[PDB]
Swiss-Prot record, chain A:
It is found in: Cytoplasm; Nucleus. Its main location: cytoplasm. Disulfide bonds: none annotated. InterPro entries: Ntn_hydrolases_N, Proteasome_alpha, Proteasome_alpha-type, Proteasome_alpha_type_5, Proteasome_asu_N, Proteasome_sua/b. The lineage of its organism: Eukaryota, Metazoa, Chordata, Craniata, Vertebrata. This is Proteasome subunit alpha type-5. The modification Phosphothreonine is found at T47. Gene3D superfamilies: Glutamine Phosphoribosylpyrophosphate, subunit 1, domain 1.
Curated annotation (Swiss-Prot), chain B:
Gene3D superfamilies: Glutamine Phosphoribosylpyrophosphate, subunit 1, domain 1. GO terms for cellular component: cytosol; nucleus; P-body; proteasome core complex; proteasome core complex, alpha-subunit complex. InterPro entries: Ntn_hydrolases_N, Proteasome_alpha, Proteasome_alpha-type, Proteasome_asu_N, Proteasome_sua/b. Phosphorylated on tyrosine residues; which may be important for nuclear import. GO terms for biological process: proteasome-mediated ubiquitin-dependent protein catabolic process. Pfam families: Proteasome, Proteasome_A_N. The keyword Cytoplasm applies. The gene is PSMA2. This is Proteasome subunit alpha type-2. It comes from Bos taurus. The 26S proteasome consists of a 20S proteasome core and two 19S regulatory subunits. The 20S proteasome core is a barrel-shaped complex made of 28 subunits that are arranged in four stacked rings. The two outer rings are each formed by seven alpha subunits, and the two inner rings are formed by seven beta subunits. The proteolytic activity is exerted by three beta-subunits PSMB5, PSMB6 and PSMB7. Component of the 20S core proteasome complex involved in the proteolytic degradation of most intracellular proteins. This complex plays numerous essential roles within the cell by associating with different regulatory particles. Associated with two 19S regulatory particles, forms the 26S proteasome and thus participates in the ATP-dependent degradation of ubiquitinated proteins.
Curated annotation (Swiss-Prot), chain D:
GO terms for biological process: proteasome-mediated ubiquitin-dependent protein catabolic process. The gene is PSMA3. The 26S proteasome consists of a 20S proteasome core and two 19S regulatory subunits. The 20S proteasome core is a barrel-shaped complex made of 28 subunits that are arranged in four stacked rings. The two outer rings are each formed by seven alpha subunits, and the two inner rings are formed by seven beta subunits. The proteolytic activity is exerted by three beta-subunits PSMB5, PSMB6 and PSMB7. Interacts with AURKB. Interacts with CDKN1A. Interacts with MDM2 and RB1. Interacts with the C-terminus of TBXA2R isoform 2. Interacts with DNAJB2. This is Proteasome subunit alpha type-3. The lineage of its organism: Eukaryota, Metazoa, Chordata, Craniata, Vertebrata. The modification Phosphoserine is found at S239. It comes from the Eukaryota.
From Swiss-Prot, chain F:
One of its GO terms (biological process) is proteasome-mediated ubiquitin-dependent protein catabolic process. The 26S proteasome consists of a 20S proteasome core and two 19S regulatory subunits. The 20S proteasome core is a barrel-shaped complex made of 28 subunits that are arranged in four stacked rings. The two outer rings are each formed by seven alpha subunits, and the two inner rings are formed by seven beta subunits. The proteolytic activity is exerted by three beta-subunits PSMB5, PSMB6 and PSMB7. Component of the 20S core proteasome complex involved in the proteolytic degradation of most intracellular proteins. This complex plays numerous essential roles within the cell by associating with different regulatory particles. Associated with two 19S regulatory particles, forms the 26S proteasome and thus participates in the ATP-dependent degradation of ubiquitinated proteins. It comes from the Eukaryota. Transmembrane segments: none annotated. This is Proteasome subunit alpha type-4.
Length: 232, 228, 204, 241, 231, 246, 242, 240
C-alpha cells in the first residue's frame, strides 16, 4: 500500500496525478473574456427524460461581480464555493471594498493541498478535490478570467475550455480569438463549438450561459433569452 | 499510540488471539483450588531451576484484602498488573461503602478489565486465568476467570498443564461434606500426580480462607502436612 | 439565611424492636404558603426510610440521585441495602460537592434484615454522621425538640407508646415555629408491618 | 517479506536494530573531521570538499560554537547537525538560567545523547545520520573531549577521527605524543594528517578549517588566526614533499 | 520496499523520497542569479503553456526570491519569511539579515524528513538580498541544506549555464548594472533547444542594491536590456 | 503503522461488510434461545451448555438477566462482550427515569443500544460486538413486547422467535403451530417444551439442560419469575403424557 | 483517535468505496415515488413478510416533519441515523427561522452529510439512497433523490433499489398528463409498476399518500386488494382489445 | 510455528510464545561481555569484565558500574545506550520515593518498579523491549545483603549468586558447585571465588587492569568501587 502525501519517481504527487484523470469524464465548459465583459457557457449531459433539468446548477454566483463554472465532481466543489463567498464578504467587512479575482482564486487555491493523516485532522481532510474551476469577473483593472487545477496553481488566461473533450476544442478556440473581438461573436463561437463537440443536440435547456459585463452584475440567461441567438 | 484492534473475527466467527493466549496457560505451573464448608484452599507449584535461586523472595499467592485471596496459571509478569488493579478497586469500594468488598463484584470488575484489553488500541490479551477465593456472610466462594473476560462459579476445579487429568481425579473424590483438613490432602495429592521428581515444601505454596482471614502457610505447616 | 428560605423539620426515634420517623408537610417561600402536601420521607428499600430537610430543590435532587445509585446497586448484586452502607453513600454524595454544595440535612431510619436491629442516623451539610441511640433531629426547630425529647424518652418503648411519644413532641415543637407546620406525617416500622398515620394540627 | 529492517521497533532474530546500522553508513560516506586534545586545550580539524567553483569559502560550515567554551565538529547530514547544535545551545542556556553557572561537558553530552537515543525505539521516527564531537577547557576541570554517535553513545577520547578515513587518521595520530606537546606544536601536525589522508584521485580539491580552545584563547572558542593557518599549510606542503 | 516512506533508510544510507522530491526541481522553468560587488540580480523564463504563471516574488524591501518547484508550497515559505521579517521589525526595529532567515527556513524544512505521514517540500529557491556586509545570494533545496554562492541557476538543462558561468566567473565585482544584466541574460540563453531566442514575453528580472529596494520588471519594461545580442 | 491494520470497517467489492456477517456465523453456535408472547404474559426459554460438578444456582440465573422493574434479556452470543451491554442498558433506563421520572419504554431502550454498535461498524477501528439478544417487557402504550437485535445495529419486533443453534428449523415449525390471538400462558409453555426437545440435539430434556422465565402483571405490579426444578419437572412430565395421548 | 485514509482515488478517479456502497442498493428493497398534480405517492415494496412480524416496527416510510416524508433502499441502521439527524436539523431550523423548512434545504443538508464522509478520516460512507417527497409552501409538490456520493436531482418519477431499471423503463413510457388526472389514478400507476418486480402478487406493499394538509396516510390491505382486482380487470379488458 | 505478523511485534503465536522477547534476549550476547554477583554474611560483591582495544581512549569514562544512590549499586549488560536510560530512571524513582515516603527505598521495590516498566513494552506494539539486564546490590537493616536482577520480560527475583552476559550458563553451572559445601564467606571468599569463577570460565589469567568490583558491607554500607592497589593485593594473594 501507499500514503496520500507520497511522491513518485518523477517529482509528481500520486493522488493529484490520479485525480486529474477524473475531469476527463465530466462535462465541458468554456470561458471567454473580452474588452467589455466575459462569457461562461456549460453543458448539462442529461441522462433520462424524467429529470427536472432546472435542478442542475453548474454556474453559480460568488458575488455581484464574480462567477464560476465547474467540472469533474460536482460534490467536492460545494465546500470551496462557500469558502470563496465567505472570504469576499469578510473583505468588504474590514476594508469596505470589493475583492479581486486574483485574490479570490488565491484564497481558494490555498485550500487545495491541505490533506494528510499526521495532523489530528479536525478538518478531516483526507484527499484532494477532483474539480476544475473557471472563474470570471470585473475588477479595478478590466475583466479577468482564471483557471484552477486540483493542485493549486491558478493562472490567468484569455479563453479556455475544460472537461472531457477539452483537447481539440481548445484548438478551435485558439484560432477564433482577437483582442478586439466583441461579446456577441465570442458567444456564437462558443455555442457552435459546443454544438460540434456535443453528442445529442443543442437545445436552450441543455446549456447554461452567463455574463459579467461591466456596469451590470452577474447574469444568467433565461430560456427565452437564449433561443433568440441559436437561430443561426 | 496505535489506535486499532489487533484481535479480530476470523471467517469462522472465532477470535483466534484469545485461543492463542489460552494456549499459554497450558504451561502455567499447575494450580489447584478446593472448596469446603469451613473455608477454601488454594495451592500452586513452583519450578525453581537451581539451588542458587532464593525462596523467601518470590510469592505467587498474594492477598487482596483481609478476606480475599488469589492465584494464577500462566504469565507472571502479566499477573502483578491485575494484583495491583484489584488492590485498587477493593480500596475504592471500601472508601465508598465503608465495608469490605464481596468476592463476586471483584471478579466482575477484574474480568471487565481483562475484556477491555481485548478490542482496544494496540494491545494483546493477557496470558493468565486467575483463581480467587473469599468468604462472605458465612459462606465460602471460589471463582475462575479467563483471558476472554468470562468467569464461572466453580467447585473444586483445576487448571494448568494436566487439568483434563486433574478434574476427573477430583470428581471421584469430592464428598461435599468435608472439613478443612482433608481437602488440603486432596489438593496436595492431585498435583502429586503432575510432579516430576521428589517433592518437598520449597516446591509448593498454600493458602486458606477460613472465618478468620486469608492466610498463607509457612514452610513449617506445609512440612507438617507433607507428613501424610 | 438560605437554609431557612423554605422551612422544614424532621425527627426520628428508636424503641425496642421498632423504629419511627416523622415530618411536617408544608411548602412555602420565606413567608408564604403554597401547598400542604409536600413529601419529605422517601423509602430506600423496605424497612428503611430517609427524610430530608432544607432547600427543596436539593431535597428532590438528592432523592433522585440516591434512587439512581440504589437501583444500580440492587441490580448489580441482589441484596436489599443495609443502613450503614446508605449512610456512607450519602456521605460520599454530599462531600463530592465540598465546594458548591447542597443544603439538605438527611436523617435515616431502618432495621437490619438479619436480626431486625434498629438503627437511626443524622448527617450534616457535608457528611458528619452522628449515630445516636436516643433519637435524631434535623431542621430549623431543633432546639425546640432537643429539650422536648430529652424529657419524655425512655429506653424501652412499645409501639403504641412510641407513637404517642414522637407525636406530642413533634406537634408541641412545631407549634412554636412559624416556618414549619401545617400537618404531620408519621411512619412506624415493625418486624412484619408498617403503619402510616397523619395527625390533627393547627393551620395557623 | 522479511520486514525486519523497515522499522526501529523491530529486533532481528540475531538481535540487531538494522535501521541504526543503516543510518551509521552515511557517516562512512562523508568527509573527515578529526580532533585531538593536548595539555592546554583542544584542537579540531576539518576538510571541506569544494564541489564547484561557484560556492564561496565559508559556506556549509562544519564547525559550530555551542557556548562560550564549547564547540562542535560534525560529519554526515548537516541539517540534523544544525538541529542538534541548537538543541545543545538550548540545554546550556536553560541550565545556566536555572543553576547559575556554566554547564560542564559530561552533563551536556549525556543530555544530548539521551535525546538522540529516543529515536531508536519508536516506529514514528527515524534515527539521526550524524556523528558529532564536543570539546571544552576550564581552570578547574581542564581539557575535555567527547564524541557522540547516531545510537546515543558518549565516550571520552584522546583523539577521534569520525568520518570516512577513520583507521588511517587513527594510525597516523597514534604516532604522536600530544600529552607532552603544547597548543602550538600541534596544529601543523593536524594539517599534516589531513593532507596525508586525503587523496587527489577520487576527489579534486578541498579546503581546511580549524578551531581553538584553551589557554591561548582563555576559555573562549575561536577560529585560528590566518597567519597561524598559513604557517600550518606551509609546513604541511613542505613535509608532503 | 524502501521507497514509499520517508522514515526508512536504505542499505546504503539513501532516503529515496528526498531524491524523488529533488527530481521535481529539474523539470520546471530555469532561473539564474549571480552576485556583483554592489548589486544582486535574478531572472527567469516564464515558459508559457497560451498563458502561464509568474516565477518571481517579493519578500521585503531588501530580500526577494525566485522559485522553481511546486507553486502551492512556495507560497507557504514566502508567508513564513514575510511574517518573520515583520516580527523582527516589530520587536527590534531593524531589517532582519539574510543568514539568520535562511537558517530559520532550513530548520522549518527538516522536521517532515524525520517522522511519519509527512512529505518534504518539493521546491528549490534562489534568494537575493543586501545588508551591512553587502549583497548576498543564497540557494535552498528540499533537503534542509542551504549554500552561499557567487552564481547559481536551477531547472532543466541548467548545466550549460553553470559551465558558462564557471568560464565567466572571474569577471564580476566590477561590471556595472546593465553589464551584469547582459551577462546573466546571455548565460540563460543557452538553456534552449537552439530553436528560440529570448524575448519580452518570456523574461522577468528583479534587481536589488544599496540604492534600490528590489524592483521587479515586467514584460513591458524588459526591452531596454535586450540590445547587444549575437548568435 | 499501515501494514498491520485490517481497517476494520470496509465495504467489500459486493457491498457487504465481512466482520459483521462473520460474527453472525458464530452467533449460530451459541445457546439456543426462544421467545413467545401470549395474551396474558410473555415467556422466554433458553438452553444451557455447562454440565459438570459446578456451583449452580449461585446467582439468579446464568443466561437471563434484568434491566429494570419491567424488562429482561436473553443474550445468546459471547458472554464477555455481553456483560457490558447489560450495564449500558441499565444506565440508559436509570437516566431516562432520572430525567422524565417514569419507566422507560422498551423500544427506546432497544434503539439506544442498536445505535451504540453501529458506530463500531463505521468509526474507530475496533471489532464490533458479537451478540444477538431477545428483550421482553411491558409498557402502558402497547402492552407486552418482545424484541430482537443483531450484531450490526438491526432490530425487529415479532410474535415468536428463536435464535442460536438450529433457529431456522424452529422458526419453520413455529409459524404453523401458533394461533393468532388464540393463545395463553398455559399452552405457550407447552409449545416451548415441545419445540425445545424437537430442536435440541439431546434425546430428551432432564430439566437440567434448560431454563425458563415468565413475565406477567399481578395486581398492578410486574413479576419476572424463574421456575424451580419441580415446576419444570411437572411440565416435562405433562408434555410426556400429552405426547403419550397419541 | 483514528486518522487514516479510508476512501481514496484510483488510476481512473474511480473512488472505490462509493462504487461499492452503490452495490448494496442494487440488492435492497425496491421503492417508487410519484409527483401527481395535487398528491404525492410512495409505493415502497419488496417486503419479505413472514406472518409473525409486527408491521409497525419495520416500516421504511418515515416522517421527518409534518411537511416532509422519506423512503430508503439500503442498510437500515444508517438510515435511522440519517433520519434522526434530519429531524434534529428540521427542528433547529424551525427554531431560528420562524417558518418551516423546504424540501431543498433538508435535501442539501443530507447531501452535505453524505459527502463529508467521503473525505473525512476514520469515517466510512453511508450505504443508502433516499427518496424524499414533500409539499412546499404554495403547494408545489416536490420529489427529490440522493446517492451516497453527495449528489441530488429533482425527478418526476424515479425508482431505486433492485429492479429499478425495469421500473424506470416502464415508467418513462407511461407517465403522461392525460394519465395523471385524479388521486385514484396516481396510485394505480405505482401498483402497475411494482407488479413487475413483484414476486407473488399484492402481498408485499406499503403504499402511502401525501395530500394537502393530511400530513400522512397508510392504506389497509382491503383497498390494496380492491385496486389489485381493478388492475386485473383492466388488464383483462385490454387483452380482449388486442 | 508462525502465522501473520507474529515475529515483528508483541503478539501471541499458535504455540503461545512471544518471539520478539526471545529475539531481544540475544541482544546481550552482542557486546560480548559478562558479569557476576554473589553475597555472603555481611557483604555483596559484583564483578564484570573490561576491554579496551584502542590506545587513544580515556580509560575513565569506560565503566559499566554506576551509583544509583549512596547505599545501592548496579551493573548492566548488553547494549550501552539503553542501560543509561534505565540508570537515570532508577535514580529518579529512588529520589521520588525518598521525597514522598520519608525514608530510603529498598532494593526490592526498585527491582519491582523497573520490571513493571520493562514489561509494559511486552504488551504494546509501537515500542520494543530494551536489550539489557540490571543487577543490583544493597544492604538493609533486617535481612542484610540483597542481590536482585531484571530481564527484558518483566521478571524479577532474589538470588544468592548469579551471572549474566554471554557465558551465563557455564558461570552459573560452576557457581552451583560451591554453594553445596558452603562455608563462612565473610570478605575474602566472595571476591576470591568470583574472580576464580571468571578465570575458570575464561582461563586467561586476569591482570589488575581489566576488572571493576563494587562492595557493600554492613560495617560501611556506602557504595565504593575500588583502587587498583586493592586489586593488586587480592591478585597477588590468590595467585600463590
Amino acid at each position: 500500500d501507499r500514503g496520500v502525501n507520497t511522491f513518485s519517481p518523477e517529482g509528481r504527487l500520486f493522488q493529484v496525478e490520479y485525480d486529474i484523470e477524473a475531469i476527463k469524464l465530466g462535462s465541458t465548459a468554456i470561458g471567454i473574456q473580452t474588452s467589455e465583459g466575459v462569457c461562461l457557457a456549460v453543458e448539462k449531459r442529461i441522462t433520462s427524460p424524467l429529470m427536472e433539468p432546472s435542478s442542475i446548477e453548474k454556474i453559480v454566483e460568488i458575488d455581484a461581480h464574480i462567477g464560476c463554472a465547474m467540472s469533474g465532481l460536482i460534490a467536492d466543489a460545494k465546500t470551496l464555493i462557500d469558502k470563496a463567498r465567505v472570504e469576499t464578504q469578510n473583505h468588504w467587512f474590514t476594508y469596505n471594498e470589493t475583492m479581486t479575482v486574483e485574490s479570490v482564486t488565491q484564497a481558494v487555491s490555498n485550500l487545495a493541498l491541505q490533506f494528510g493523516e499526521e495532523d489530528a485532522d479536525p478538518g478531516a481532510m483526507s484527499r484532494p478535490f477532483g474539480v476544475a474551476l473557471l472563474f470570471g469577473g470585473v475588477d479595478e483593472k478590466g475583466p479577468q478570467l482564471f483557471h484552477m487545477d486540483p493542485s493549486g496553481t491558478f493562472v490567468q488566461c484569455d479563453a479556455r475550455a475544460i472537461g472531457s473533450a477539452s483537447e481539440g476544442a481548445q484548438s478551435s478556440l485558439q484560432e477564433l480569438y482577437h483582442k478586439s473581438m466583441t461579446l456577441k461573436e465570442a458567444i456564437k463561437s462558443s455555442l457552435i463549438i459546443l454544438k460540434q463537440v456535443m453528442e445529442e443536440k443543442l437545445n436552450a435547456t441543455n446549456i447554461e450561459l452567463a455574463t459579467v459585463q461591466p456596469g451590470q452584475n452577474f447574469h444568467m440567461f433565461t430560456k427565452e433569452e437564449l433561443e433568440e441567438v441559436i437561430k443561426d | 499510540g496505535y489506535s486499532f484492534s489487533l484481535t479480530t473475527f476470523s471467517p469462522s466467527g472465532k477470535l483466534v488471539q484469545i485461543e492463542y493466549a489460552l494456549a499459554a496457560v497450558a504451561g502455567g505451573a499447575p494450580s489447584v483450588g478446593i472448596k469446603a464448608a469451613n473455608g477454601v484452599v488454594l495451592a500452586t507449584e513452583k519450578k525453581q531451576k537451581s539451588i542458587l535461586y532464593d525462596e523467601r523472595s518470590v510469592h505467587k499467592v498474594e492477598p487482596i484484602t483481609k478476606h480475599i485471596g488469589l492465584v494464577y496459571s500462566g504469565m507472571g509478569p502479566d499477573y502483578r498488573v491485575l494484583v495491583h488493579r484489584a488492590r485498587k478497586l477493593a480500596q475504592q469500594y471500601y472508601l465508598v461503602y465503608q465495608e469490605p468488598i464481596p468476592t463476586a463484584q471483584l471478579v466482575q470488575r477484574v474480568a471487565s478489565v481483562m475484556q477491555e484489553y481485548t478490542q482496544s488500541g494496540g494491545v494483546r490479551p493477557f496470558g493468565v486465568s486467575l483463581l480467587i477465593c473469599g468468604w462472605n456472610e458465612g459462606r465460602p466462594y471460589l471463582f475462575q476467570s479467563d483471558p476472554s473476560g468470562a468467569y464461572f462459579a466453580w467447585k473444586a476445579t483445576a487448571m494448568g498443564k494436566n487439568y483434563v487429568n486433574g478434574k476427573t481425579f477430583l470428581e471421584k473424590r469430592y464428598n461435599e461434606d468435608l472439613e478443612l483438613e482433608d481437602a488440603i490432602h486432596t489438593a496436595i495429592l492431585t498435583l502429586k500426580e503432575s510432579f516430576e521428581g521428589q517433592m518437598t515444601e520449597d516446591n509448593i505454596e498454600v493458602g486458606i480462607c477460613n472465618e478468620a482471614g486469608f492466610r498463607r502457610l509457612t514452610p513449617t505447616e506445609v512440612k507438617d502436612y507433607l507428613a501424610a | 439565611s438560605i437554609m431557612s428560605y423554605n422551612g422544614g423539620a424532621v425527627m426520628a426515634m428508636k424503641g425496642k424492636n421498632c423504629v419511627a420517623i416523622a415530618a411536617d408537610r408544608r411548602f412555602g417561600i420565606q413567608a408564604q404558603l403554597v401547598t400542604t402536601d409536600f413529601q419529605k420521607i422517601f423509602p430506600m428499600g423496605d424497612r428503611l426510610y430517609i427524610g430530608l430537610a432544607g432547600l427543596a430543590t436539593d431535597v428532590q435532587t438528592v432523592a433522585q440521585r440516591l434512587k439512581f445509585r440504589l437501583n444500580l446497586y440492587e441490580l448489580k448484586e441482589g441484596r436489599q441495602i443495609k443502613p450503614y452502607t446508605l449512610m456512607s453513600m450519602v456521605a460520599n454524595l454530599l462531600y463530592e460537592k465540598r465546594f458548591g454544595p447542597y443544603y439538605t440535612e438527611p436523617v435515616i431510619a431502618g432495621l437490619d434484615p438479619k436480626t431486625f436491629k434498629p438503627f437511626i442516623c443524622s448527617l450534616d451539610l457535608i457528611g458528619c454522621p452522628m449515630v445516636t441511640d436516643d433519637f435524631v433531629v434535623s431542621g430549623t426547630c431543633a432546639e425546640q425538640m432537643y429539650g422536648m425529647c430529652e424529657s419524655l424518652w425512655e429506653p424501652n418503648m412499645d409501639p403504641d407508646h412510641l407513637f404517642e411519644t414522637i407525636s406530642q413532641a413533634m406537634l408541641n415543637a412545631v407549634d412554636r415555629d412559624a416556618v414549619s407546620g401545617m400537618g404531620v406525617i408519621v411512619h412506624i416500622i415493625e418486624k412484619d408491618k408498617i403503619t402510616t398515620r397523619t395527625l390533627k394540627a393547627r393551620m395557623d | 517479506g522479511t520486514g525486519y529492517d523497515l522499522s526501529a521497533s523491530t529486533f532481528s532474530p540475531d538481535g540487531r536494530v538494522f535501521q541504526v546500522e543503516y543510518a551509521m553508513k552515511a557517516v562512512e560516506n562523508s568527509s573527515t573531521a578529526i580532533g585531538i586534545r593536548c595539555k592546554d586545550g583542544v584542537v579540531f580539524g576539518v576538510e571541506k570538499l569544494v564541489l564547484s567553483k561557484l560556492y564561496e569559502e565559508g559556506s556549509n560550515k562544519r564547525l559550530f560554537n555551542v557556548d562560550r567554551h564549547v564547540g562542535m565538529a560534525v560529519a554526515g547530514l548537516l541539517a540534523d547537525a544544525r538541529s542538534l547544535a541548537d538543541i545543545a545551545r538550548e540545554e546550556a542556556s536553560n541550565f545556566r538560567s536555572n543553576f547559575g553557572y556554566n554547564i560542564p561537558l559530561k552533563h551536556l553530552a549525556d543530555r544530548v545523547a539521551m535525546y538522540v537515543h529516543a529515536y531508536t525505539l519508536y516506529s514514528a521516527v527515524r534515527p539521526f545520520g550524524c556523528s558529532f564531537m564536543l570539546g571544552s577547557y576550564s581552570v578547574n576541570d581542564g581539557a575535555q573531549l567527547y564524541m557522540i554517535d547516531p545510537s546515543g553513545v558518549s565516550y571520552g577520547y584522546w583523539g577521534c577521527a569520525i568520518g570516512k578515513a577513520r583507521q588511517a587518521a587513527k594510525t597516523e595520530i597514534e604516532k604522536l605524543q600530544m600529552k607532552e606537546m603544547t597548543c602550538r606544536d600541534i596544529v601543523k601536525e593536524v594539517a599534516k594528517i589531513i593532507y596525508i589522508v586525503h587523496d587527489e584521485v577520487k576527489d579534486k580539491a578541498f579546503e581546511l578549517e580549524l578551531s581553538w580552545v584553551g589557554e591561548l584563547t582563555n576559555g573562549r572558542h575561536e577560529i585560528v588566526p590566518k597567519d597561524i593557518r598559513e604557517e600550518a599549510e606551509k609546513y604541511a606542503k613542505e613535509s608532503l614533499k | 520496499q524502501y521507497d514509499n516512506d520517508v522514515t526508512v533508510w536504505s542499505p546504503q544510507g539513501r532516503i529515496h523520497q528526498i531524491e524523488y522530491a529533488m527530481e521535481a526541481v529539474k523539470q520546471g522553468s530555469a532561473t539564474v542569479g549571480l552576485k556583483s560587488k554592489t548589486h544582486a540580480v535574478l531572472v527567469a523564463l516564464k515558459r508559457a503553456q497560451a498563458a502561464h504563471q509568474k516565477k518571481i516574488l517579493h519578500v521585503d524591501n531588501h530580500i526577494g526570491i525566485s522559485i522553481a518547484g511546486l507553486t502551492a508550497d512556495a507560497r507557504l515559505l514566502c508567508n513564513f519569511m514575510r511574517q518573520e521579517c515583520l516580527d523582527s521589525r516589530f520587536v527590534f526595529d531593524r531589517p532582519l539579515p539574510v543568514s539568520r532567515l535562511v537558517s530559520l527556513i532550513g530548520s522549518k524544512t527538516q522536521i517532515p524528513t524525520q517522522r511519519y505521514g509527512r512529505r518534504p517540500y518539493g521546491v528549490g529557491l534562489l534568494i537575493a538580498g543586501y545588508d551591512d556586509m553587502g549583497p548576498h545570494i543564497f540557494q535552498t533545496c528540499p533537503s534542509a541544506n542551504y549554500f552561499d554562492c557567487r552564481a547559481m541557476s536551477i531547472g532543466a538543462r541548467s548545466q550549460s549555464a553553470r559551465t558558462y558561468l564557471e568560464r565567466h566567473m572571474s569577471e564580476f565585482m566590477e561590471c556595472n548594472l546593465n553589464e551584469l544584466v547582459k551577462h546573466g541574460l546571455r548565460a540563460l540563453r543557452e538553456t534552449l533547444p537552439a530553436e528560440q531566442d529570448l524575448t519580452t514575453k518570456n523574461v522577468s528580472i528583479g534587481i536589488v542594491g544599496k540604492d534600490l529596494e528590489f524592483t521587479i520588471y515586467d514584460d513591458d519594461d524588459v526591452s531596454p536590456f535586450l540590445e547587444g545580442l549575437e548568435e | 503503522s499501515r501494514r498491520y491494520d485490517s481497517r476494520t470497517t470496509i465495504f467489500s467489492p459486493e457491498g457487504r461488510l465481512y466482520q459483521v456477517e462473520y460474527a453472525m456465523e458464530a452467533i449460530g453456535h451459541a445457546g439456543t434461545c426462544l421467545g413467545i408472547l401470549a395474551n396474558d404474559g410473555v415467556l422466554l426459554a433458553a438452553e444451557r451448555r455447562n454440565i459438570h460438578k459446578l456451583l449452580d444456582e449461585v446467582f439468579f440465573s446464568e443466561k437471563i438477566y434484568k434491566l429494570n422493574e419491567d424488562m429482561a434479556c436473553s443474550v445468546a452470543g459471547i458472554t464477555s462482550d455481553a456483560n457490558v451491554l447489560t450495564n449500558e442498558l441499565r444506565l440508559i433506563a436509570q437516566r431516562y427515569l432520572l430525567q422524565y421520572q417514569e419507566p422507560i419504554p422498551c423500544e427506546q431502550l432497544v434503539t439506544a443500544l442498536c445505535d451504540i454498535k453501529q458506530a463500531y461498524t463505521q468509526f474507530g477501528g475496533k471489532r464490533p460486538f458479537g451478540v444477538s439478544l431477545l428483550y421482553i417487557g411491558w409498557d402502558k402504550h402497547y402492552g407486552f413486547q418482545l424484541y430482537q437485535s443483531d450484531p450490526s445495529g438491526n432490530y425487529g419486533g415479532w410474535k415468536a422467535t428463536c435464535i442460536g443453534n438450529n433457529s431456522a428449523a424452529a422458526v419453520s415449525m413455529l409459524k404453523q403451530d401458533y394461533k393468532e390471538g388464540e393463545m395463553t400462558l398455559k399452552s405457550a409453555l407447552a409449545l416451548a417444551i415441545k419445540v425445545l426437545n424437537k430442536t435440541m440435539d439431546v434425546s430428551k430434556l432432564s430439566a437440567e439442560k434448560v431454563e425458563i422465565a415468565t413475565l406477567t402483571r399481578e395486581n398492578g405490579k410486574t413479576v419476572i419469575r424463574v421456575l424451580k426444578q419441580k415446576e419444570v419437572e411437572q411440565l416435562i412430565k405433562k408434555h410426556e403424557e400429552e405426547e403419550a395421548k397419541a | 483517535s483514528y486518522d487514516r485514509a479510508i476512501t481514496v482515488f484510483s488510476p481512473d478517479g474511480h473512488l472505490f468505496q462509493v462504487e461499492y456502497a452503490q452495490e448494496a442498493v442494487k440488492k435492497g428493497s425496491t421503492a417508487v415515488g410519484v409527483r401527481g398534480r395535487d398528491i404525492v405517492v410512495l409505493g415502497v415494496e419488496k417486503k419479505s413478510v413472514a406472518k409473525l412480524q409486527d408491521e409497525r416496527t419495520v416500516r421504511k416510510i418515515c416522517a421527518l416533519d409534518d411537511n416532509v416524508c422519506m423512503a430508503f433502499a439500503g442498510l437500515t441502521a444508517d438510515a435511522r441515523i440519517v433520519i434522526n439527524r434530519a429531524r434534529v436539523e428540521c427542528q433547529s431550523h424551525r427554531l431560528t427561522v420562524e417558518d418551516p423548512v423546504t424540501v431543498e434545504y433538508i435535501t442539501r443538508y443530507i447531501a452535505s452529510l453524505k459527502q463529508r464522509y467521503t473525505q473525512s478520516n476514520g469515517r466510512r460512507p453511508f450505504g443508502i439512497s433516499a427518496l424524499i417527497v414533500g409539499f412546499d409552501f404554495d403547494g408545489t409538490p416536490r420529489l427529490y433523490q440522493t446517492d451516497p456520493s453527495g449528489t441530488y436531482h429533482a425527478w418526476k418519477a424515479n425508482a431505486i433499489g433492485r429492479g429499478a431499471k425495469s421500473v424506470r423503463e416502464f415508467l418513462e413510457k407511461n407517465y403522461t398528463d392525460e394519465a395523471i388526472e385524479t388521486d385514484d389514478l396516481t396510485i394505480k400507476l405505482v401498483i402497475k409498476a411494482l407488479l413487475e418486480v413483484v414476486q407473488s402478487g399484492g402481498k408485499n406493499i406499503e403504499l402511502a399518500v401525501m395530500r394537502r394538509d393530511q400530513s400522512l396516510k397508510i392504506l389497509n390491505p382491503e383497498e390494496i386488494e380492491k385496486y389489485v382486482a381493478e388492475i386485473e380487470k383492466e388488464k383483462e379488458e385490454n387483452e380482449k382489445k388486442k | 510455528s508462525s502465522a501473520g505478523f507474529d515475529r515483528h511485534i508483541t503478539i501471541f503465536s499458535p504455540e503461545g510464545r512471544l518471539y520478539q522477547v526471545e529475539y531481544a534476549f540475544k541482544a546481550i550476547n552482542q557486546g560480548g561481555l559478562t558479569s557476576v554477583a554473589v553475597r555472603g554474611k555481611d557483604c555483596a560483591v559484583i564483578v564484570t569484565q573490561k576491554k579496551v582495544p584502542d590506545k587513544l581512549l580515556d580509560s575513565s569514562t569506560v565503566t559499566h558500574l554506576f551509583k544509583i544512590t549512596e547505599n545501592i549499586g548496579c551493573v548492566m549488560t548488553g547494549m550501552t545506550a539503553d542501560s543509561r536510560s534505565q540508570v537515570q530512571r532508577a535514580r529518579y524513582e529512588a529520589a521520588n520515593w525518598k521525597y514522598k515516603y520519608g525514608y530510603e527505598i529498598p532494593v526490592d521495590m526498585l527491582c519491582k518498579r523497573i520490571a513493571d516498566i520493562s514489561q509494559v513494552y511486552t504488551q504494546n506494539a509501537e515500542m520494543r523491549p530494551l536489550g539489557c539486564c540490571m543487577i543490583l546490590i544493597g544492604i538493609d537493616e533486617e535481612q542484610g545483603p540483597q542481590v536482585y536482577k531484571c530481564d527484558p520480560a518483566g521478571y524479577y527475583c532474589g538470588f544468592k549468586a548469579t551471572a549474566a552476559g554471554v557465558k551465563q550458563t557455564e558461570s552459573t553451572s560452576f557457581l552451583e558447585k560451591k554453594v553445596k559445601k558452603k562455608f563462612d564467606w565473610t570478605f575474602e571468599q566472595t571476591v576470591e571465588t568470583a574472580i576464580t569463577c571468571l578465570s575458570t570460565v575464561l582461563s586467561i589469567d586476569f591482570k589488575p587492569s581489566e576488572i571493576e568490583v563494587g562492595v557493600v558491607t554492613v560495617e560501611n554500607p556506602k557504595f565504593r568501587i575500588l583502587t587498583e592497589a586493592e586489586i593488586d593485593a587480592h591478585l597477588v594473594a590468590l595467585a600463590e
